[PDB]
mmCIF file of the C-alpha atoms, coordinates in Angstrom:
data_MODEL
# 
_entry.id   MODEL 
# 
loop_
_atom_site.group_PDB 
_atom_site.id 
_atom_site.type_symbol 
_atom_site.label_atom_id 
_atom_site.label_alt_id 
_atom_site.label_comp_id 
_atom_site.label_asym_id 
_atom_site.label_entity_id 
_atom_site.label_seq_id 
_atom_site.pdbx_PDB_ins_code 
_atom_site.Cartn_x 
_atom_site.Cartn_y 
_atom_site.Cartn_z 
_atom_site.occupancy 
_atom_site.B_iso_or_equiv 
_atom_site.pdbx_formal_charge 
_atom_site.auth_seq_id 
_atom_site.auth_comp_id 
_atom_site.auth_asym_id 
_atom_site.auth_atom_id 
_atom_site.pdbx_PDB_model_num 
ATOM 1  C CA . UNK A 1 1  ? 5.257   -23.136 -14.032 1.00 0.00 ? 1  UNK A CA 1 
ATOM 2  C CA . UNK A 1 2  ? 3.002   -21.499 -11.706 1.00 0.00 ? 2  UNK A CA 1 
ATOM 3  C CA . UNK A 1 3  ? 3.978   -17.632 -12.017 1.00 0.00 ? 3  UNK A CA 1 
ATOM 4  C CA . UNK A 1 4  ? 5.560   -16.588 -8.498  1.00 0.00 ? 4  UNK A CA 1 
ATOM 5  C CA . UNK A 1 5  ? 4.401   -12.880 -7.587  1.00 0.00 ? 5  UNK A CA 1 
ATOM 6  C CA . UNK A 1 6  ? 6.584   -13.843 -4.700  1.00 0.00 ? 6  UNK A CA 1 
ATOM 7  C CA . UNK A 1 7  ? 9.082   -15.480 -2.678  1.00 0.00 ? 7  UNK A CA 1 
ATOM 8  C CA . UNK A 1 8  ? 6.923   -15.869 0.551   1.00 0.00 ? 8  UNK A CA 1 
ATOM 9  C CA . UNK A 1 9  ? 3.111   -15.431 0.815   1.00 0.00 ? 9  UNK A CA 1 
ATOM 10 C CA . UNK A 1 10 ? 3.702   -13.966 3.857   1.00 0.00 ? 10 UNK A CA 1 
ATOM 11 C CA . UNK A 1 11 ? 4.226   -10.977 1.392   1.00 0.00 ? 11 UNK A CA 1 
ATOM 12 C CA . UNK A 1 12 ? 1.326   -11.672 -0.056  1.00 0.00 ? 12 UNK A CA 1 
ATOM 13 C CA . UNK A 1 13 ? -1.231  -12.310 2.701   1.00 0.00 ? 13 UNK A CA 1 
ATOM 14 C CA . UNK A 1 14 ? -0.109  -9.101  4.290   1.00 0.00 ? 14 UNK A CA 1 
ATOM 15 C CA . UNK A 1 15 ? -0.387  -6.896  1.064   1.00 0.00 ? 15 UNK A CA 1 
ATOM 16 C CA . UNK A 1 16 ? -4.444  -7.775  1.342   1.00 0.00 ? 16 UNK A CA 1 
ATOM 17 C CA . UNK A 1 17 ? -4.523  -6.589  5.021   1.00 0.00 ? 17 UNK A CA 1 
ATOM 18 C CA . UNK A 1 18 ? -3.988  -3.304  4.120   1.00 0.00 ? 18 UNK A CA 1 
ATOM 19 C CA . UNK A 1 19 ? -7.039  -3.030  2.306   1.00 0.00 ? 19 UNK A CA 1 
ATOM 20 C CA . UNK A 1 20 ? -9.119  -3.233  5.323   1.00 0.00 ? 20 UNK A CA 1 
ATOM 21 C CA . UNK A 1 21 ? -7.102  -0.135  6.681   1.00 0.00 ? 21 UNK A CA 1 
ATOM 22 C CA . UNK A 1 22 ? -9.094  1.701   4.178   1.00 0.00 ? 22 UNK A CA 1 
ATOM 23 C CA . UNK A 1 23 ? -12.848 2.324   4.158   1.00 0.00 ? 23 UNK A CA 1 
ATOM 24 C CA . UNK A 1 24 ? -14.063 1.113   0.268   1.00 0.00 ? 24 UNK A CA 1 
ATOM 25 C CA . UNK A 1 25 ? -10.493 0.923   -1.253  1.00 0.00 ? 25 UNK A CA 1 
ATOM 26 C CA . UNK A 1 26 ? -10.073 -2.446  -2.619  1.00 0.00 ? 26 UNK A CA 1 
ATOM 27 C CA . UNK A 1 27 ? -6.573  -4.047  -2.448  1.00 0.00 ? 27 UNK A CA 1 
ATOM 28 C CA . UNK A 1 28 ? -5.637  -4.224  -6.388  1.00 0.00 ? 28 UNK A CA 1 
ATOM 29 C CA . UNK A 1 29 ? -7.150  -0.803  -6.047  1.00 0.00 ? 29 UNK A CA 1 
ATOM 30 C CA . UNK A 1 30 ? -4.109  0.846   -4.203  1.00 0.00 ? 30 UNK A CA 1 
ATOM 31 C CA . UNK A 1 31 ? -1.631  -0.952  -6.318  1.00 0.00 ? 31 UNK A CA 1 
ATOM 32 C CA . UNK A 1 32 ? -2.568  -0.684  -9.623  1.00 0.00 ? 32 UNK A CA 1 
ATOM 33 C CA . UNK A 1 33 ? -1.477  2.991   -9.296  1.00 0.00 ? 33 UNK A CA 1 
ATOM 34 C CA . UNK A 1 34 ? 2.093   1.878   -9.870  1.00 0.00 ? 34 UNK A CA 1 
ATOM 35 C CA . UNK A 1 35 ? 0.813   2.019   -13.645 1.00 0.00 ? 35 UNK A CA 1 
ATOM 36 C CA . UNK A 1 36 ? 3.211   0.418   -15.353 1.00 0.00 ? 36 UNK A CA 1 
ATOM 37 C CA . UNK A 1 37 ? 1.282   -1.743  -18.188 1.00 0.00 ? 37 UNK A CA 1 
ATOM 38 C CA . UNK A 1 38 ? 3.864   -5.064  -17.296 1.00 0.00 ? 38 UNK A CA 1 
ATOM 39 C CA . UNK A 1 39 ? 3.301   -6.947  -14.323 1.00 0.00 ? 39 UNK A CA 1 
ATOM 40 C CA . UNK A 1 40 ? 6.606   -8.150  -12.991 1.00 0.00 ? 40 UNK A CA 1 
ATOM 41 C CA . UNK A 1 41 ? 6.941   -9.747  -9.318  1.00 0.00 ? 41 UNK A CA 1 
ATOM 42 C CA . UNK A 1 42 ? 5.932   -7.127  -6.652  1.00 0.00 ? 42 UNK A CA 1 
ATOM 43 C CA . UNK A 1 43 ? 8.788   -6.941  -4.284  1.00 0.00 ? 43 UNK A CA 1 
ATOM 44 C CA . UNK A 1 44 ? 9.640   -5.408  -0.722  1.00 0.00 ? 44 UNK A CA 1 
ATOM 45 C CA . UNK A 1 45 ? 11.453  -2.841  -2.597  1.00 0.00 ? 45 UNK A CA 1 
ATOM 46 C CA . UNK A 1 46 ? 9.186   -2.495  -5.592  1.00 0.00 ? 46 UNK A CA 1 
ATOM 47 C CA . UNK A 1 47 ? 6.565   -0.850  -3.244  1.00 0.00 ? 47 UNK A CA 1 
ATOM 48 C CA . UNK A 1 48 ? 9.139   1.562   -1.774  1.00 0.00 ? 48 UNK A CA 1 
ATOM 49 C CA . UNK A 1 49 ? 9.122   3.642   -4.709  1.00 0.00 ? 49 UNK A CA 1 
ATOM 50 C CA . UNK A 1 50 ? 5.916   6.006   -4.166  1.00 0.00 ? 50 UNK A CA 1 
ATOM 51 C CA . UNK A 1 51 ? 4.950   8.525   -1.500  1.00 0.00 ? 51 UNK A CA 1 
ATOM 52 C CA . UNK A 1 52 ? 1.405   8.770   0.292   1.00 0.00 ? 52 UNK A CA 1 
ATOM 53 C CA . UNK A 1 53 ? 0.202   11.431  -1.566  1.00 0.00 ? 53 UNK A CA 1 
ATOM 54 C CA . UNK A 1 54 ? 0.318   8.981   -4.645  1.00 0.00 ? 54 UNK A CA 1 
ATOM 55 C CA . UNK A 1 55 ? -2.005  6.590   -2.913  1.00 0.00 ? 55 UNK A CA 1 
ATOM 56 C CA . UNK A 1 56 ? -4.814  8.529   -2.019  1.00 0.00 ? 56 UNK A CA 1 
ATOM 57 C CA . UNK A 1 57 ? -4.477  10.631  -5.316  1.00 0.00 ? 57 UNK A CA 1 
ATOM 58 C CA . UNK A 1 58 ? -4.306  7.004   -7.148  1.00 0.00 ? 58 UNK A CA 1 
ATOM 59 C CA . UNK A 1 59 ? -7.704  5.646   -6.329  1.00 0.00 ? 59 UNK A CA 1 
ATOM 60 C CA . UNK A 1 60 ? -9.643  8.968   -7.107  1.00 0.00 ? 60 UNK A CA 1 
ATOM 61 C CA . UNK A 1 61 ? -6.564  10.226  -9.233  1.00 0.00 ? 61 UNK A CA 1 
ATOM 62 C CA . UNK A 1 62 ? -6.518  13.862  -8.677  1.00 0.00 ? 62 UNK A CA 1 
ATOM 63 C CA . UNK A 1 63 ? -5.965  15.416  -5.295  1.00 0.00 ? 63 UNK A CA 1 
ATOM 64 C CA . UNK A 1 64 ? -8.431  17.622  -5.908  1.00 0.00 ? 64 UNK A CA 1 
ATOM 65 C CA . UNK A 1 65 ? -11.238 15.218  -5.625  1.00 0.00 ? 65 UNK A CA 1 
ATOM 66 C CA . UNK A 1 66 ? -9.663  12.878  -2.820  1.00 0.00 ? 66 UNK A CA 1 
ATOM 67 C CA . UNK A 1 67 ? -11.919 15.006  -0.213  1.00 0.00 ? 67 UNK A CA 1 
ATOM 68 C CA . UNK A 1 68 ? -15.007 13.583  -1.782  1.00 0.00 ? 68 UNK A CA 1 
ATOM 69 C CA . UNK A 1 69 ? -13.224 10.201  -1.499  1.00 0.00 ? 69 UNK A CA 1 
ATOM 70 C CA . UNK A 1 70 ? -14.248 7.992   1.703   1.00 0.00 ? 70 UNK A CA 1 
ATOM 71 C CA . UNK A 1 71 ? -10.567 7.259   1.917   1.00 0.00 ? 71 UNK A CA 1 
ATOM 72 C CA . UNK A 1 72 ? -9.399  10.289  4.884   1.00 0.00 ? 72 UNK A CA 1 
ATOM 73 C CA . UNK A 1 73 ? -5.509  11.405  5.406   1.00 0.00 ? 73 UNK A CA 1 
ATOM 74 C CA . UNK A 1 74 ? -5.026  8.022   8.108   1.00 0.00 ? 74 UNK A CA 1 
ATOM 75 C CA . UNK A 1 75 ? -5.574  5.737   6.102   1.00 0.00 ? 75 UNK A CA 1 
ATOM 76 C CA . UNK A 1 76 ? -2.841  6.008   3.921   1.00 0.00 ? 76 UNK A CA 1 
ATOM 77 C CA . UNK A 1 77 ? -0.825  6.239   6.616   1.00 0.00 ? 77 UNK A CA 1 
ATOM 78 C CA . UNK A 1 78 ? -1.986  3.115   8.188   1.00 0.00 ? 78 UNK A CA 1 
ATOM 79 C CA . UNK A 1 79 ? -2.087  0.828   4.656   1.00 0.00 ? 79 UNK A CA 1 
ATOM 80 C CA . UNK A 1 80 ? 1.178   2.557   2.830   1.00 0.00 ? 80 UNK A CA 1 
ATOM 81 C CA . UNK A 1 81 ? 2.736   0.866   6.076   1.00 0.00 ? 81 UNK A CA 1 
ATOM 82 C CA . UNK A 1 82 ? 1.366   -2.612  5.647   1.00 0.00 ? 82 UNK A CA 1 
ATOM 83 C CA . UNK A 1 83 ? 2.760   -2.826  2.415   1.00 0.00 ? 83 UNK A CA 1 
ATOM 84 C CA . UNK A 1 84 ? 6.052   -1.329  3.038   1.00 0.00 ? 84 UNK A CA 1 
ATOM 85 C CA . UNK A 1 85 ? 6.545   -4.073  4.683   1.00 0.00 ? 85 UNK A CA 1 
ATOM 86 C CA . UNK A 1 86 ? 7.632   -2.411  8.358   1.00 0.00 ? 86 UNK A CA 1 
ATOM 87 C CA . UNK A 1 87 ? 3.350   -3.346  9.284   1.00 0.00 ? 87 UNK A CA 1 
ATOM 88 C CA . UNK A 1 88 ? 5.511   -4.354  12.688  1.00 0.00 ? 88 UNK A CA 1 
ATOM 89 C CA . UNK A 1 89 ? 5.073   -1.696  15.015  1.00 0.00 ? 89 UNK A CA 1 
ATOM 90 C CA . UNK A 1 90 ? 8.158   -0.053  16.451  1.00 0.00 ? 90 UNK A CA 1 
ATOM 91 C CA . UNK A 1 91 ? 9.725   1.289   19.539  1.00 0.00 ? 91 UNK A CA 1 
ATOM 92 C CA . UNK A 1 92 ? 7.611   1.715   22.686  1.00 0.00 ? 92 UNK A CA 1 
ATOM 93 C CA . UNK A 1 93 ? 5.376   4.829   22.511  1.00 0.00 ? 93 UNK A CA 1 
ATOM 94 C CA . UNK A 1 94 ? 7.881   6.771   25.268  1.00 0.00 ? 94 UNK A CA 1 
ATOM 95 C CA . UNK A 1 95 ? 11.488  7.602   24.102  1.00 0.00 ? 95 UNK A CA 1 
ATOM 96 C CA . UNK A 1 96 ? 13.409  4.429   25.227  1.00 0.00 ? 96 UNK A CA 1 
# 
């Protein structure tokens, strides 16, 4: 055995990234706010289940306190991309 979070690393590696897109935030630190007690293998689609405002509200936990939190309103933005697993950019800036 070996317990496989994953099929690819890849997955992994990139997962870890997004941690950096955030000031303090560690990277099991903007996870863990799936809850869920059970680990389970965290999928492409797994993470695709939460909005923004979950993340930011996750690490401090109540949106009311976030503003006190180092973590600003781009941030999100930028990591709950990584994860989502689209971290490639898209079109050109101008309307193709």
């Amino acid at each position: 055995m070996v317990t496989p979070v994953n099929m690819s690393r890849e997955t992994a590696l990139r997962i870890a990234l997004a941690a950096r897109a955030l000031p303090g935030t560690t990277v099991g630190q903007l996870l863990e706010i799936l809850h869920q007690r059970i680990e389970g293998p965290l999928t492409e689609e797994s993470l695709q289940g939460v909005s923004v405002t979950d993340l930011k509200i996750g690490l401090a936990g109540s949106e009311e306190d976030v503003d006190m939190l180092d973590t600003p309103m781009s941030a999100l933005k930028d990591a709950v991309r990584i994860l989502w697993g689209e971290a490639e950019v898209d079109s050109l800036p101008q309307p193709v």
